[PDB]
Amino acid sequence: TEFLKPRLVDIEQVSSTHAKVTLEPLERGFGHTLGNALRRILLSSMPGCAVTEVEIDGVLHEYSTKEGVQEDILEILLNLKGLAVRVQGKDEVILTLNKSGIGPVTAADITHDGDVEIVKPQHVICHLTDENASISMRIKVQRGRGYVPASTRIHSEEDERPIGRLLVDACYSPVERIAYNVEAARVEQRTDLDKLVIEMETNGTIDPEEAIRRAATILAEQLEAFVDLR
């Protein structure tokens, strides 16, 4: 009975998204078990924020066009599905966008509140091709987990909304790609040990240390109802 425990050792930020997390020592046969358990629970149960309703003035349904804007409104919605915010205190916020003049409209000039962090401020939303054109929008941002389409939400809710709220599908989870790797480690005379290396590719919104801690937490909580009772 020579049980041995792992400890989180090294974190090496390759870039602002990619990240590699090392973790050792592990006795034989435990690289793969932990590796695959928390690969399966990082890709499905992380919490993050994403846009879920858009209101743009002077537009009634999402199939029209507008004066002096390159994209028609379906394209504006499909461009807004993929901006990455980070909300500190609340669980829902209303952001405001407002611009006029020729040029591309990027995500940089969302009129920031006090506690909303926008990750990439160079992500394009619209194109304005006339000197008199202007655009003004009100976005809502929420918090949740998993994947939730618009049909489910529209059929669940009894509340009434005006002619002009447009519903967007939501995709809350921040983790994009994940791949682990088991390697042979070096301890004084024990040549039997291992090491685990998880490489993680996400947008912003999650600092990797917190990701691994949340995964381990929910696994232990799941096992708890499985130890004591019988």
Binding site: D159, E160, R161, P162, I163
Partner: protein
């Protein structure tokens, strides 16, 4: 003329109405045209039947 676009009263009324969705409210006003225009504003701005 678009008088219902900068008043404080209309804004206050919408704010009060939309946070108490389980109250029946009787709003009384001065004359007919004002009543119809208030109804239109509420219906097309906040969907309050």
């Amino acid at each position: 003329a678009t008088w219902w676009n900068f008043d404080p009263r209309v804004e206050w009324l919408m704010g009060y109405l939309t946070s108490h969705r389980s109250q029946k409210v009787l709003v009384i006003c001065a004359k007919a045209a004002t009543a119809l225009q208030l109804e239109q504003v509420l219906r097309e701005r906040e969907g309050i039947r």
